[PDB]
Ligand binder design. Structure first.
Ligand SMILES: *[C@H](C)[C@H]1/C(=C/c2[nH]c(/C=C3N=C(/C=C4\NC(=O)C(CC)=C4C)C(C)=C\3CCC(=O)O)c(CCC(=O)O)c2C)NC(=O)[C@@H]1C
Ligand SMILES: *[C@H](C)[C@H]1/C(=C/c2[nH]c(/C=C3N=C(/C=C4\NC(=O)C(CC)=C4C)C(C)=C\3CCC(=O)O)c(CCC(=O)O)c2C)NC(=O)[C@@H]1C
Ligand SMILES: *[C@H](C)[C@H]1/C(=C/c2[nH]c(/C=C3N=C(/C=C4\NC(=O)C(CC)=C4C)C(C)=C\3CCC(=O)O)c(CCC(=O)O)c2C)NC(=O)[C@@H]1C
Ligand SMILES: *[C@H](C)[C@H]1/C(=C/c2[nH]c(/C=C3N=C(/C=C4\NC(=O)C(CC)=C4C)C(C)=C\3CCC(=O)O)c(CCC(=O)O)c2C)NC(=O)[C@@H]1C
Ligand SMILES: *[C@H](C)[C@H]1/C(=C/c2[nH]c(/C=C3N=C(/C=C4\NC(=O)C(CC)=C4C)C(C)=C\3CCC(=O)O)c(CCC(=O)O)c2C)NC(=O)[C@@H]1C
Ligand SMILES: *[C@H](C)[C@H]1/C(=C/c2[nH]c(/C=C3N=C(/C=C4\NC(=O)C(CC)=C4C)C(C)=C\3CCC(=O)O)c(CCC(=O)O)c2C)NC(=O)[C@@H]1C
Ligand SMILES: *[C@H](C)[C@H]1/C(=C/c2[nH]c(/C=C3N=C(/C=C4\NC(=O)C(CC)=C4C)C(C)=C\3CCC(=O)O)c(CCC(=O)O)c2C)NC(=O)[C@@H]1C
Ligand SMILES: *[C@H](C)[C@H]1/C(=C/c2[nH]c(/C=C3N=C(/C=C4\NC(=O)C(CC)=C4C)C(C)=C\3CCC(=O)O)c(CCC(=O)O)c2C)NC(=O)[C@@H]1C
Ligand SMILES: *[C@H](C)[C@H]1/C(=C/c2[nH]c(/C=C3N=C(/C=C4\NC(=O)C(CC)=C4C)C(C)=C\3CCC(=O)O)c(CCC(=O)O)c2C)NC(=O)[C@@H]1C
Ligand SMILES: *[C@H](C)[C@H]1/C(=C/c2[nH]c(/C=C3N=C(/C=C4\NC(=O)C(CC)=C4C)C(C)=C\3CCC(=O)O)c(CCC(=O)O)c2C)NC(=O)[C@@H]1C
Ligand SMILES: *[C@H](C)[C@H]1/C(=C/c2[nH]c(/C=C3N=C(/C=C4\NC(=O)C(CC)=C4C)C(C)=C\3CCC(=O)O)c(CCC(=O)O)c2C)NC(=O)[C@@H]1C
Ligand SMILES: *[C@H](C)[C@H]1/C(=C/c2[nH]c(/C=C3N=C(/C=C4\NC(=O)C(CC)=C4C)C(C)=C\3CCC(=O)O)c(CCC(=O)O)c2C)NC(=O)[C@@H]1C
Lengths: 88, 162, 273, 172, 162, 172, 162, 172, 162
């Protein structure tokens, strides 16, 4: 959904779509700085919340930096996000 | 895919609440209607072919120049495609009748319609005629609610195309 | 509120939007029922033209409702200049006024009495003008005639509310703006029993009229300078009632006749009734 | 998302074909059961609170340690979560039951649940147990209502079971 | 307020699209059901009073100690309130039947239920009995779908209370 | 939000009373018309695209200047908006029609609309005009459909009108 | 409006930084180019009309059926419009040459292009021919960089249309 | 980001030295070609739409199944994506061509691309194919323009190729 | 790293569009300027050393007390560092000339400048003199545009330092 939005309307509309999203507004409408809502159960969540948030969030020392080698790392949530359910 | 049933689930799910009476009422609606819907689909499915021939044909009458050499309507490959395409539209329509929602239509046909059509220079107009011609024929084999249903879906596409 | 930039970095006319906030739209991160900050009951945002449609739909889809939209360029404009009204000027019609002097008064009267509003050749009153300049009528009396005239009624009194007409009246007949909810209430009751003529009569007859520009002085703007028994807020209300030079009281404009002074603001200066 | 109807469609689509007459007859009959189907759902939703309450009591009577200091249901905060979770699972199950398809349940609810539980250290086995306890209670209601036209619900009852079980399995 | 009709509008509105066949099907459901719903409401509305008396009463049988001095059930004021309250529950239920959604219930009764009850030390239990007793009586005056509907809503509250 | 039913409720609530039998009979009959009501809506939605297209053509034939440089419908960008808006208004109207109540239309759609138009310098008059043009075309369809059982829709037709008109008025 | 000059300002403005050498280099590029650009505009502006006639005409040759009754190309009003429209395209192009950016084109022509065209059933194809025919003529009156510039902008539209 | 110049700098920096005279002469020469370089880019951008259109047609003539039900370019939705992607890749390639460096292409576009395609079930082979088809068409234009001063563009042409190929390889 | 070329790419990329005429114009600017820029760099690179000695020296004249014992200017280590540092400034400047943007300067020198300087109690003033002295010398070896370019970059640092 977001990748299409970007291709039609560019980086500015892409960004605007998160901040103007109903979800952003309901948890932190205005006047509240965004915080980590992950790692605790959020209505609508869908499983995979908790698991994927642990991949995106390293420790408190970790950060999302590119300075090590110029490129940002690759997505690291592509394989998750597309896993079958394990044979029950 | 958007059907009645999926939607109410979705809505229930978002709010984080159990399916209460509100939603079931809605579901009930879908099921009652189905009988008519299903009937319509059986009718289209059977006459498919004949509808398709008629449509393709029509288009050419409506836009003679298409059949001239150097045009799109010209040379069998294109005609074959033209047929194929309309078949599809029909196919999906039936699907939607049965699924009881536009869902099937939306995801196969509608989403991306414009751009595809732009990049290959398919003129919406054409399709439309096809549909209209169809609608007219269907307006004989069907009647009452079955008919009404058939129309709804057929139109839905007209509007999406235009 | 003040808006600091007229346009976004990408070209785009900003528009100030004012809404009544709703708990859904913004809420404290607190346990218990969500509450919007009381101070922001009326929230204001400046949005570029592009996001305006989305912004407004969202507001309305929640319990928000839009109080008003206004272009940022009109907003974030200087408060009107008071230069011409700080010292009104004042016109005296002497006895044995020569032809020109009488003309000047007439013009001045139409200006103040009608607002900037233009009076056409056909609208203008020969009869009333006739009387002035062969004596017989005071400037004060001419002023009464103008407020009696249909011209006046059609613009000020027949389009807007009686609530609006009162302050409209105050400003024209007295430079002052209205002070207090009581004045508005008194005039309304006068109008219901006595009717339109008696109400008009009560401003010219009032001693405040007599004390300033009592007779044979065209009314001027007393408000914008400090007056006896005037609530401080009245001065602020004068800035709302009087918008710039070349700003008028016009039935003509879209939704022409509305209230410059909010009812609540009047209540602040004084309550009792 | 998906459900019984949509599913059949999709299959048909890949073949590239109109729906088989045979296949219609699946859906035709599926419709006929609707009413039964609905009542089933209604029964769960109506009794929700209770179903859970009940299951919990039984869960804790069996596995005393969960509620002992140092256990996974102790202290209050944890207990609360455990209850919340039960509910969620139930909620989904119901959803599925209406759809006539596991999918919804599998995707939003089940998928990655195990891993979460693992990371937390919550004992998957116990969770599974709870789910079953729920199952039995729930069926109890589905199957024994009042003021409904008496008839055979078995077919639905079993499908209900399956949903519960998919849950139990994938969590466990 | 959440009714079938309002919801489909809402959903349509969010996506930014016209009401298509999907939603109308749902609406139709609401309207078909109404006949039963309406019937139920007429029945409750008529017997209101009698239901209320019976309920209030019941509660006291169930919890004798309430009527002892220094308790909540004691002294007429409280009894009056107790009556009033149950009336309300009933009133709303009827509303919901007619509106064809839980909406009315949610907004009047349910939202804020807990905190009110906490601050005034009203025990959910009580209400519940009231309802149950009611449900039992209603289970005579009504039958078939009308009945079913009545139950649904009655329960909905039980669950919210508990 | 609100609609015909909910509304009646709310009124009743403030009186503090059960619904009057008289009042039920309003709703009872309202139900009976449903089918008609629905078809009406269906007709609009089915023809939507066209309704607009049509109205536009007529709007621009009349007010040539809108499409001339310096006008409000020029250039493309603006034109696009103007079309979009028309549609929206329509969309809402339909919604109302289904609800059986103006509210939805007033609150989501009409509220603030005038002021916007003003601030932009969009000529409210012309907007209103468009809305009417739409109205007439729309009725056209509502009133002349295909495959519908023959009967009297007037009642609905008029209510439709009113909605359109509320729109026209508040914009204008 | 996007021109070289406006952009660098914008970029500088966002970062909150003075215009440093980086940006001026860019500016220098524009203004150096201008000489050629300006020349091109003088050439188009002068031959405008003739270009327009030729184009409109072409379109009809390319799509004969348009001129038949009951079509879009038929009846003077439409022809007038057709002319008008192309004039516009041209007008803007000149503008863009002079402004030294696509800006003018983007905001007048391109933004909303699709939807307009959809709602009024203007076929992109047509416009395109117009342009192409133009391009061909321009390919005589101009040469070297002046030419190159003219093309760039003309094309820019072709791509936007397609 | 990076480009030919910046790159050389960075290298020099780690040695800790002023730029070698030899190295300047790379850049000096690079400048001289600018005009050619530019025109090359201009040619791509000018023909963009077409390049793609063309390549696609050929892609689908070859791999008929992609457009058959069950294939990856079916249905419309998917087709659209496939077109979109092609374009993007092209866009980046062009960028690189101007920069005089692969980087931009690698970092924004190629990095992770394979894996994405994999996860979706998109057949990497076909993607690669498309990229080549594009390549050839593109060169076609770069190499045969109109109104341009005649001379030798080979050097640029080859570099263009390489970019396309890096793409093909990393996707494949 | 911010150079003309990278920026236009970036801007193009953000909007999501192909490089159109707008950007190329800008690029062209960078390339034509380069000839002058490159010249300047050759000149600085050659005289580097001499410039450095002269600067370091200057600083001491300007701030005699630094060379007294117990100060920072005192003892060879410090002098060595002082030399090293200025070398760097120069080095980077050359880089920036060649890269055709401030990029190199920003990332090596400027970012973090303040804090470094604060924590080690290096007085910006010093550096500045160094630069100024340099600027003055450069103002002999160069002329016309080459000169102009050299200045721009030299200054850019002065401003960043101050
Ligand atoms: C029929 C009215 C005209 C016609 C049609 C025609 N279509 C194509 C090519 C395509 N048609 C479609 C349409 C669809 N493909 C899908 O997957 C779906 C959704 C299920 C639809 C509706 C597509 C995608 C293509 C492009 C790719 C392909 O080859 O299928 C052509 C060929 C045009 C070309 O190759 O550029 C034609 C001619 N032919 C006629 O005679 C009518 C004028
Ligand atoms: C209770 C003694 C009286 C009463 C209170 C009452 N308040 C509301 C609604 C709101 N009250 C507030 C108050 C605050 N919000 C804040 O953030 C603060 C502290 C920072 C206060 C004190 C607000 C903002 C609202 C409106 C929005 C919201 O719900 O937060 C109501 C309900 C009004 C309604 O119709 O929603 C009531 C009843 N009113 C009484 O009846 C008592 C006399
Ligand atoms: C003419 C170039 C354009 C035009 C003008 C127009 N103006 C009005 C109405 C008024 N305009 C003013 C103007 C002024 N008031 C002042 O005091 C001054 C400076 C001292 C000016 C210039 C005012 C006061 C009015 C309002 C009072 C009135 O209308 O009688 C109109 C009439 C509006 C109406 O709808 O009746 C018009 C037409 N409008 C055009 O069409 C031209 C572009
Ligand atoms: C109760 C039967 C058992 C139990 C449960 C339990 N769960 C947690 C904590 C969490 N539970 C979840 C689960 C979910 N996330 C989802 O997305 C879904 C549905 C898709 C579920 C069901 C999550 C995310 C958490 C962690 C964050 C949170 O607290 O919301 C606990 C608490 C453990 C902790 O340390 O946080 C417990 C106890 N454990 C038992 O003992 C029972 C057997
Ligand atoms: C199965 C677990 C139980 C059961 C079910 C059962 N139900 C019916 C019939 C109906 N059930 C309903 C219920 C609804 N229809 C709706 O539209 C809604 C949503 C608002 C509900 C809740 C309806 C209306 C019918 C038709 C009339 C009726 O109630 O009979 C049957 C009859 C046979 C059939 O196939 O429908 C049965 C068997 N009976 C059992 O054995 C369990 C108690
Ligand atoms: C009846 C089962 C028991 C009982 C009840 C009782 N209730 C109160 C006080 C209140 N009851 C309510 C309930 C509602 N008020 C509402 O607005 C609604 C929504 C429509 C409900 C359900 C409320 C809010 C109150 C609080 C204050 C008030 O005046 O209503 C009392 C009095 C307790 C007190 O502390 O004042 C009592 C006793 N009475 C009995 O005899 C039963 C045990
Ligand atoms: C068309 C008949 C007429 C017309 C319309 C027009 N509108 C705009 C711009 C906007 N119109 C709206 C509309 C709405 N705001 C809302 O809240 C709602 C209801 C929910 C609607 C329908 C808005 C928000 C805008 C501003 C933002 C936007 O981009 O749309 C324009 C363009 C104005 C401009 O200067 O860009 C136009 C042209 N104007 C005409 O010429 C017709 C008479
Ligand atoms: C009114 C503008 C025109 C008209 C309407 C009309 N409709 C009916 C009857 C029905 N219309 C429907 C349609 C629907 N019902 C649904 O559930 C849905 C959504 C899926 C639709 C679209 C239905 C089912 C009926 C009942 C069966 C039937 O079609 O006869 C009537 C008959 C009277 C009645 O109220 O039933 C009428 C009059 N007919 C006209 O003459 C107007 C032009
Ligand atoms: C010429 C190839 C064909 C043709 C064209 C034609 N155009 C219209 C109507 C419109 N044309 C445009 C286009 C523009 N208006 C703008 O503001 C701009 C941007 C500056 C453009 C490019 C528009 C917006 C319209 C809509 C209504 C209007 O005229 O403004 C028509 C009329 C079609 C109709 O029924 O509305 C026609 C026919 N005429 C021919 O004969 C060729 C086939
Ligand atoms: C076309 C030649 C082939 C094709 C393409 C195809 N792609 C997708 C989906 C996506 N592809 C991408 C592409 C990119 N991600 C990036 O970040 C970049 C560089 C910036 C690219 C080029 C992405 C993001 C997606 C996923 C999002 C989405 O689903 O749209 C699909 C759709 C897959 C699906 O199952 O829906 C397709 C079809 N597939 C073919 O058949 C061609 C061989
Ligand atoms: C190479 C793929 C093909 C080719 C190109 C080519 N171009 C030139 C010379 C120039 N081309 C341009 C073009 C631009 N310069 C700019 O600044 C811009 C963007 C604003 C463009 C588009 C210019 C100005 C020149 C110099 C002037 C001139 O036209 O001669 C040459 C000549 C070589 C050279 O300039 O050193 C060549 C070869 N021609 C071919 O033979 C290839 C097919
Ligand atoms: C010269 C005018 C004065 C002087 C300088 C001096 N500098 C240091 C220490 C540092 N100077 C720098 C400067 C840089 N290092 C970098 O990496 C960069 C960016 C490429 C710059 C500009 C740094 C970072 C240091 C700290 C680390 C180090 O040991 O080099 C000193 C020593 C300070 C100390 O506390 O030991 C001195 C004395 N010396 C003179 O004679 C002048 C007064």
């Amino acid at each position: 959904e977001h990748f299409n939005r970007y291709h039609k309307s560019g980086y500015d509309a892409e960004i605007d779509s998160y901040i103007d999203s109903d979800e952003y507004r309901r948890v932190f409408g205005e006047n509240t700085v965004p915080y980590f809502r992950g790692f605790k159960y959020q209505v609508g969540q869908a499983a995979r919340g908790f698991d994927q948030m642990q991949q995106l969030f390293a420790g408190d020392a970790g950060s999302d930096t590119d300075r090590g080698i110029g490129a940002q790392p690759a997505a690291k949530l592509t394989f998750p996000l597309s896993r079958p359910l394990g044979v029950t | 895919m958007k059907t009645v049933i999926t939607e109410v689930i979705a809505s229930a799910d978002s709010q984080g609440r159990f399916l209460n009476n509100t939603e079931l009422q809605a579901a009930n609606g879908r099921f009652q209607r189905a009988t008519a819907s299903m009937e319509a689909a059986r009718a289209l499915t059977s006459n498919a072919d004949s509808l398709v021939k008629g449509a393709v044909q029509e288009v050419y009458n409506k836009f003679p120049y298409l059949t001239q050499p150097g045009q799109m309507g010209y040379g069998d490959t294109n005609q074959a495609k033209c047929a194929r395409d309309i078949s599809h539209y029909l196919r999906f329509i039936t699907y939607s009748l049965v699924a009881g929602g536009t869902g099937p239509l939306d995801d196969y046909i509608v989403a991306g319609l414009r751009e595809v059509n732009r990049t290959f220079n398919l003129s919406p107009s054409w399709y439309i005629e096809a549909l209209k011609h169809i609608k007219g024929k269907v307006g004989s084999q069907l009647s009452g609610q079955p008919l009404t249903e058939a129309n709804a879906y057929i139109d839905y596409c007209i509007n999406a195309l235009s | 509120m003040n808006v600091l930039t007229t346009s976004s970095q990408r070209g785009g006319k900003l528009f100030k939007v004012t809404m009544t906030l709703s708990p859904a739209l913004s809420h404290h991160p607190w346990p218990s029922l969500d509450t919007y900050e009381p101070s922001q009951n009326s929230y204001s945002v400046v949005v570029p033209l592009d996001r305006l449609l989305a912004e407004m739909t969202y507001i309305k889809n929640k319990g928000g409702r839009v109080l008003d939209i206004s272009p940022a360029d009109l907003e974030a404009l200087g408060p009107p200049d008071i230069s011409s009204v700080a010292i009104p000027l004042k016109v005296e019609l002497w006895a044995k006024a020569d032809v020109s002097d009488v003309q000047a008064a007439i013009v001045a009267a139409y200006k103040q009495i009608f607002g900037n509003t233009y009076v056409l050749e056909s609208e203008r009153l020969t009869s009333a003008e006739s009387l002035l300049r062969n004596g017989s009528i005071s400037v004060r009396e001419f002023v009464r005639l103008l407020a009696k005239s249909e011209l006046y009624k059609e613009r000020f009194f027949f389009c807007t509310s009686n609530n609006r007409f009162t302050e409209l009246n105050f400003k024209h007949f007295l430079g002052r703006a209205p002070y207090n909810q009581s004045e508005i209430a008194a005039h309304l009751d006068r109008y219901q029993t006595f009717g339109y003529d008696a109400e008009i009569d009560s401003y010219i007859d009032s001693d405040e009229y007599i004390q300033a520009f009592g007779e044979n002085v065209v009314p001027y703007y007393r408000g914008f300078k400090s007056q006896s028994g005037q609530t401080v807020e009245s001065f602020n209300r004068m800035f709302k009632l009087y918008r710039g030079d070349a700003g008028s009281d016009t039935n003509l404009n879209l939704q022409g006749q509305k209230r410059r002074v909010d009812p609540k603001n009047l209540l602040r200066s004084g309550r009792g009734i | 998302m998906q459900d019984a109807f949509t599913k059949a469609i999709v299959a048909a689509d890949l073949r590239g074909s109109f729906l088989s007459e045979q296949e219609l007859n699946q859906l035709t009959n599926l419709v006929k059961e609707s009413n039964k189907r609905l009542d089933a759902v209604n029964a769960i939703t109506g009794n929700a609170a209770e179903i859970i309450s009940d299951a919990a009591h039984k869960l804790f009577a069996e596995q005393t340690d969960l509620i002992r200091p140092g256990g996974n249901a102790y202290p209050n905060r944890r207990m609360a979560a455990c209850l919340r979770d039960m509910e969620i699972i139930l909620r989904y199950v119901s959803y599925a039951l209406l759809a006539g398809d596991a999918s919804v349940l599998e995707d939003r609810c089940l998928n990655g649940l195990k891993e979460t539980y693992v990371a937390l250290g919550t004992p998957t086995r116990s969770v599974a147990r709870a789910v079953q306890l729920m199952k039995e209670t729930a069926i109890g209601y589905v199957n024994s209502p009042s003021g409904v036209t008496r008839g055979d619900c078995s077919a639905l009852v079993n499908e209900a079971a399956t949903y519960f079980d998919k849950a139990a399995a994938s969590i466990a």
